[PDB]
Amino acid sequence: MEDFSVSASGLFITNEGNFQYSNATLSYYDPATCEVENEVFYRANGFKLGDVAQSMVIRDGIGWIVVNNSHVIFAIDINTFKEVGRITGFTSPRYIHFLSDEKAYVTQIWDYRIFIINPKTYEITGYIECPDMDMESGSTEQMVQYGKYVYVNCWSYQNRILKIDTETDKVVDELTIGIQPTSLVMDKYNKMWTITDGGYEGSPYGYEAPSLYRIDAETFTVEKQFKFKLGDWPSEVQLNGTRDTLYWINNDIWRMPVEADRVPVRPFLEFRDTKYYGLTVNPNNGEVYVADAIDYQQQGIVYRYSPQGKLIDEFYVGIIPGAFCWKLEHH
Ligand SMILES: [Cl-]
């Protein structure tokens, strides 16, 4: 059990590990030293993280790690990585969205409810019931704020964006699109971007050419659609800090101005017969980090790029690195 006291500026990489093998880990990268530290939760705390670390959000000096398949969210101190508390009772958590110090939503797979939680007391306070959704095929996923509203994508065996009114904690609208929207971002024009994964071969629910969509938040309608190829399996819409440049995964890493009418012919980073899996854009300097799962078995690798596409650094992380979380000194 180990004493960490790290940089005020930093990058966390969550490593899902192998679903049903409890080898998920946390990585911490220092961009100023170009040094990675691996398995930092375990080293810091004396216990393992669990199964499928999904995502992670930092608020007010505290890091909130969603461990999807261990029914828990760890709160760690972000400088020491020691746990300050945890929340148990999630069916299968995905993403955490704070509305205040005392109120956050936590999405779930295999549940039709979004859990309301109190972060100060470390408790579950309620549930938002999703319409046309059961437990066996249920999915809520990533979330964005638009005023009093929260928008959420319904991922596994679903095909909807839902609108929640946060003042009443209830689902007030929905929009049906292509199957299995994977992720959700809000650009600086208050237009949402989601990209579907197209389902999978043999799926009971379906399997189709996936799409990238731009959806106006005010009118909750599709303004643009970029449709890809059967067998494509896109994911991970991400924005730059000014929220005017969008990246995602589709074999390659792709980059497009939010105002563009076409995807550029050339990608940001070319497919190299691996598995680009995670993605993030540094919100201050526009540097792009690409998490490569490679073969879903070996140690993953993160590549760091300049906004102009030139490789800066690369570093080994844990198994299937899927998500990132910025610890920034200045915003
Ligand atoms: Cl760890």
Numbering used by the authors: 40 to 370
Question: What is the paper's account of this structure, in its own sentences?
Answer:
Here we present X-ray crystal structures of B. theta BtuG2 complexed with cyanocobalamin (the manufactured and most stable form of B12, CNCbl), adenosylcobalamin (one of the biologically active forms of vitamin B12 with the bulkiest upper ligand, AdoCbl) as well as the precursor cobinamide (Cbi), which lacks the lower ligand and the nucleotide loop. To explore if this narrow pocket could accommodate a cobalamin with a bulky upper ligand, we obtained a structure to 2.3 Å resolution of BtuG2 co-crystallised with AdoCbl. In this structure the side chain of Trp272 has rotated, enlarging the cavity to fit the adenosyl group. The interaction is stabilised by stacking forces from Trp272 and a hydrogen bond between the hydroxyl group of Tyr335 and the nitrogen in position 3 of the pyrimidine ring of the adenosyl group. For both structures the hydrogen bonds interacting with the side chains of the corrin ring are identical. Thus, given that the lower ligand does not interact with the protein, the structures suggest that BtuG2 can bind many different, if not all, corrinoids.
Contrasting with Enterobacteria, members of the dominant genus Bacteroides often encode several BtuB vitamin B12 outer membrane transporters together with a conserved array of surface-exposed B12-binding lipoproteins. Here we show that the BtuB transporters from Bacteroides thetaiotaomicron form stable, pedal bin-like complexes with surface-exposed BtuG lipoprotein lids, which bind B12 with high affinities. Closing of the BtuG lid following B12 capture causes destabilisation of the bound B12 by a conserved BtuB extracellular loop, causing translocation of the vitamin to BtuB and subsequent transport. We propose that TonB-dependent, lipoprotein-assisted small molecule uptake is a general feature of Bacteroides spp. that is important for the success of this genus in colonising the human gut.
